[PDB]
């Protein structure tokens, strides 16, 4: 009940644009009366079918061969993280075995189990297979709070879909909620901005269109320098109130030395393998 309720609140939020993607649930337990009521409150957008993901007959029943993606939620509060990871690995194996070319989004509790999973022959991270590793992302968010305190809160609030909430009281909560009302989006931007610098289109977009750009599509570039020119046909990683606002970014045309210091890729510092007693 809580897993589906939280998923449907984020998937069907009014701040996204007018998407009409149907949601089909596959589970081997008959839903209780409160889940049946939750599906009745979403009667035109949610369907449930009772079956096992490990059964090719059930996979054909839910028409997984024509689905746009398959999402595999995980039990974050399970007693045995290893057992939960093994079960999720088996589910991924079964889905890929039935249909190798299905986009799979899954939650993985540990990082070694994520490494175990990515060895699957059909597991293609380029095609869109995303293993959202909870321990990895949470420890990365904690580390970014060590570079700038509050950044874990800053990042987490950019994903959850939230409407504007306003109250008459002058309290820190009003300002906080006003800040929380913005999410990170992604869309293609006008030919009227091709040929300009990234700082220039940022100061243009900032309050005239009311849109802030963090990055653009040498592909994924976090906060480009002043020396980079906007390619034709590119997309911007906007932060905005919603998706219907970032449409402006498109719909505008002048409407006014042998030391090994690093890893093999040159992205992390490195040293020789220290003994445990040396660092104790």
């Amino acid at each position: 009940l809580e897993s589906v309720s939280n998923f449907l609140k984020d998937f069907l939020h009014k701040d996204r644009d007018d998407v009409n993607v149907e949601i089909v649930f596959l589970h081997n337990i008959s839903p209780n009366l409160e889940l049946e009521a939750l599906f009745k409150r979403h009667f035109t957008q949610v369907e449930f079918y009772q079956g096992s993901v490990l059964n090719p007959h059930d996979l054909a029943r839910v028409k997984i061969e024509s689905a746009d993606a398959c999402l595999i939620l995980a039990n974050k509060y399970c007693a045995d993280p290893d057992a939960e990871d093994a079960s999720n690995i088996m589910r991924v194996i079964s889905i890929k075995n039935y249909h190798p070319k299905i986009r799979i989004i899954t939650q993985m509790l540990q990082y070694h189990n994520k490494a175990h999973l990515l060895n699957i022959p059909s597991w293609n991270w380029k095609e869109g297979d995303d293993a959202i590793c909870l321990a990895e992302l949470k420890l990365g968010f904690i580390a970014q709070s060590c570079l700038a305190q509050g950044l874990s809160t800053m990042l987490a609030n950019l994903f959850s879909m939230r409407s504007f909430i306003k109250i008459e009281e002058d309290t820190w909560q009003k300002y906080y909620l006003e800040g929380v009302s913005n999410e990170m989006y992604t869309e293609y931007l006008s030919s009227a901005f091709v040929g300009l610098s990234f700082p220039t289109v940022c100061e243009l977009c900032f309050v005239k269109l009311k849109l802030l750009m963090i990055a653009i599509e040498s592909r994924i570039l976090i906060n480009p320098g002043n020396h980079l020119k906007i390619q034709e046909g590119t997309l911007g990683f906007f932060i905005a109130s919603d998706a219907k606002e970032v449409k402006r970014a498109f719909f505008y045309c002048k409407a006014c030395s042998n030391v090994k210091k690093y890893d093999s890729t040159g992205m992390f510092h490195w040293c020789a393998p220290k003994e445990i007693e040396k660092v104790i």
């Binding site: 090719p56 079960s87 088996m90 194996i93 079964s94 075995n97 022959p121």
Partner: protein, 198 residues
């Protein structure tokens, strides 16, 4: 062995044995697998080398019955470690054999063959300067219904019998459930059990 000596010791036409042992796992009895390879109607130059990859605790809980055989080696690693399987020359073996001891301790009928399936997929998803799909591989499964995950090109159906499944018809999978006809065969013909045994 370890990583260094395994990698520099050239191996080809060998047998690689992948064991998911544990300190609490049951004894597989690897003697019965080694002895047929070690039989004397092969010349000594024709004896395929054997290397075991698995938990060092489980290897030191079974080595007490394998010290009188030649051409054997242990590598104390993980059967799912890509580095170990590359160091063991997995692409040049005459067989890879995948066995699991943790099959009776747990009762889930879903995770019994998870390790074996994952190891098989990891070996089949290897790039060699040829792919890992052409490697000679055999794996032992506890549940016959888990055989559908071994191959991807084949069509899968739970109703289809194990003998009819493609990975078994190719000699890629083996389960102890196919031996149940030996009761009836043995009874009707008393010499069949000794002909098979020899």
């Amino acid at each position: 062995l370890t990583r260094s000596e395994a990698a520099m010791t050239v191996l080809s036409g060998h047998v690689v044995v992948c064991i998911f042992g544990d300190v609490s796992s049951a004894l597989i009895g690897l003697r019965n697998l080694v002895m047929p390879l070690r039989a004397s109607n092969f010349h000594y130059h024709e004896l395929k080398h054997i290397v075991f990859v698995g938990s060092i605790e489980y290897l030191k809980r079974e080595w007490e019955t394998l010290h009188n055989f030649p051409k054997v080696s242990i590598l104390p690693g993980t059967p799912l470690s890509r580095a170990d399987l590359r160091a063991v020359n997995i692409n040049l073996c005459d067989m890879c054999v995948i066995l699991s001891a943790n099959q009776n301790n747990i009762d889930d009928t879903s995770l019994q063959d998870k390790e074996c399936i994952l190891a098989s997929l990891n070996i089949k998803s290897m790039q060699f300067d040829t792919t890992g799909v052409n490697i000679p591989i055999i794996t032992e499964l506890v549940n016959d219904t888990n055989v559908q995950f071994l191959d991807q090109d084949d069509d899968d159906d739970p109703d289809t019998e194990l003998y009819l499944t493609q990975p078994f018809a190719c000699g890629t999978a083996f389960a102890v459930s196919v031996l149940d006809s030996l009761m009836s065969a043995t009874y009707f013909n008393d010499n069949i059990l000794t002909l098979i045994r020899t």
